[PDB]
Design a protein around this nucleic acid. Sequence first.
DNA 1: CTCTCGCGAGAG
DNA 2: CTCTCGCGAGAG
Length: 116
Amino acid sequence: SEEDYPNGTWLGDENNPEMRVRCAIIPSDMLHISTNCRTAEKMALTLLDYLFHREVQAVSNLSGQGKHGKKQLDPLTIYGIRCHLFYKFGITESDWYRIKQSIDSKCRTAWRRKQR
DNA sequence: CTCTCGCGAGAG
DNA sequence: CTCTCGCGAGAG
């Protein structure tokens, strides 16, 4: 619902209420991202940085499972990335499976940075 | 920085 | 048991 982020933007197709998610990204920032992120792979990781602070990435993963006892990244927010990539690039479930590896791998990089 | 792959420990 | 999947870290 728009109200959760009054100065924010929609992830995915605003005219399609089942595949939209209100988010905290401001219009000027969402403009930068669409200008700069010309592939689903590059938009996914840039969305990640605008939706989650690096300090959340360094403690969090997609499942919230594993040996490091990591927090799970907000599932509604992750669904919102899925909705933006499907809308912006018409990616498939097989692409999204690949993208999710890459989000988790970025999150491990951040954990390893805090580590080192 | 991103992308990837072999590993092996718990989930099923 | 088999299967999934979180993981470290070398290579791009």
